[PDB]
From Swiss-Prot:
Positions with a binding annotation for Ca(2+): 83, 86-87
Naturally occurring in which organism (per UniProt): Mycobacterium tuberculosis (strain ATCC 25618 / H37Rv)
Domain notes: Consists of two tandem immunoglobulin-like Big_5 domains in the N-terminal region (residues 56-145 and 150-250), followed by a L,D-transpeptidase catalytic domain (residues 251-378) and a C-terminal tail (residues 379-408).
Effect after changing residue 169 to A/F: Decreases stability of the covalent enzyme-meropenem adduct
This protein's encoding gene: ldtB
Alphabetically ordered keywords of this record: Acyltransferase, Calcium, Cell membrane, Cell shape, Cell wall biogenesis/degradation, Lipoprotein, Membrane, Metal-binding, Palmitate, Peptidoglycan synthesis, Signal, Transferase
Record-given protein name: L,D-transpeptidase 2
C-alpha cells in the first residue's frame, strides 16, 4: 500500500513551450485532491497553472498559455508519508528543476499542404507534407512533441488493431517524431514526395521528405508544438497523452480532482 511518484520532465532538462509538468504514480490515486495538495510548482517568471488528471495514475500541470521561453520550473512532489486515500501512502518525495527552451511551433496547414516551422516567431523551414487521406484524416488541434526515433516499424497491432483489418497498417519508417500517444508521427516518406504539398495519402501521420524528416528529428524537441489546421478530421482528444492543449483553460483550471 505504497505508491511511488515519478515526475517529468527530468531534472536539468530543457523542453519546449508546450510541455506540461507530469506526475505519474504507480498506483491508482483514490484521493486526487490529496495528491494535488502535496505537489507545489514554482515558476520564474511566475505564471498561474493548474492540475488536470489524464487518468487515474497521472496528473498534469500547465499554464493557460504555452510557457514563456526561458522560464525556470521547480516541482516539489512532497508525497513521502502522505495519505493518498484507501490506505495508500506516498513512498518518496521527488523533485525536478527544468527550463523552457526556444518557442518552436510547427503548423501543418491542409489548405496549403505545407508544414511551417517557426522558432521564436521566425520561419526556419517550410516542408511540403502529405497528411491523412480523407477516409483516415489527420485530426486538427495542438499536439505536443514526444519521443523521436531514427527508425521504427510502425505496426497497428501495437495499438490493438490487426494489420490485415480495416484500420490496420504496417510500414517501416525513418526519422519519426511522435506527436500523439495514439501513434501520430511526423516521418520520412520518400515514396510520397510527389504527393507532398498536393494530396493526402497517409493513415494520419504527417509524411515529409527524408531530409525534412531528419531536420525535424534533429531540431524539434520534446515539448515543442505541432498545430494541425484545416483538415477534414476531428480534433485531437485532450486526454491523448500529448493532447493537453485541446482542453480549454476554463475546463482545465476547474480540474477533475473530485472525479
Amino acid at each position: 500500500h505504497l505508491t511511488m511518484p515519478y515526475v517529468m520532465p527530468g531534472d536539468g532538462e530543457v523542453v519546449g513551450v508546450g510541455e506540461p509538468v507530469a506526475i505519474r504514480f504507480d498506483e491508482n490515486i483514490a484521493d486526487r485532491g490529496a495528491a494535488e495538495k502535496a505537489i507545489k510548482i514554482t515558476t520564474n517568471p511566475p505564471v498561474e497553472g493548474a492540475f488536470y488528471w489524464l487518468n487515474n495514475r497521472e496528473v498534469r500541470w500547465r499554464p493557460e498559455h504555452f510557457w514563456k521561453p526561458g522560464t525556470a520550473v521547480d516541482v516539489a512532489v512532497n508525497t513521502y508519508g502522505v495519505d493518498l486515500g484507501e490506505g495508500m501512502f506516498g513512498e518518496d518525495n521527488v523533485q525536478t528543476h527544468f527550463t523552457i527552451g526556444d518557442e518552436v511551433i510547427a503548423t501543418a496547414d491542409d489548405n496549403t499542404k505545407i508544414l511551417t516551422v517557426r522558432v521564436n516567431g521566425e520561419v526556419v523551414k517550410s516542408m511540403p507534407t502529405s497528411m491523412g487521406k480523407d477516409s483516415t484524416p489527420t485530426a486538427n488541434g495542438i499536439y505536443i512533441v514526444g519521443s523521436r526515433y531514427k527508425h521504427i516499424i510502425m505496426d497497428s497491432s501495437t495499438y490493438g488493431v490487426p494489420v490485415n483489418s480495416p484500420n490496420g497498417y504496417r510500414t517501416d519508417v525513418d526519422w519519426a517524431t511522435q506527436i500523439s500517444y495514439s501513434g501520430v508521427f511526423v516521418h520520412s516518406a520518400p515514396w510520397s514526395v510527389g504527393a507532398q504539398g498536393h494530396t493526402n495519402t497517409s493513415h494520419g501521420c504527417l509524411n515529409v521528405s527524408p531530409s525534412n524528416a531528419q531536420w525535424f528529428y534533429d531540431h524539434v524537441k520534446r515539448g515543442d508544438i505541432v498545430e494541425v489546421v484545416n483538415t477534414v478530421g476531428g480534433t485531437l482528444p485532450g486526454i491523448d497523452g500529448l493532447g493537453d492543449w485541446n482542453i480549454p483553460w476554463d475546463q482545465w483550471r476547474a480540474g477533475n480532482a473530485k472525479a
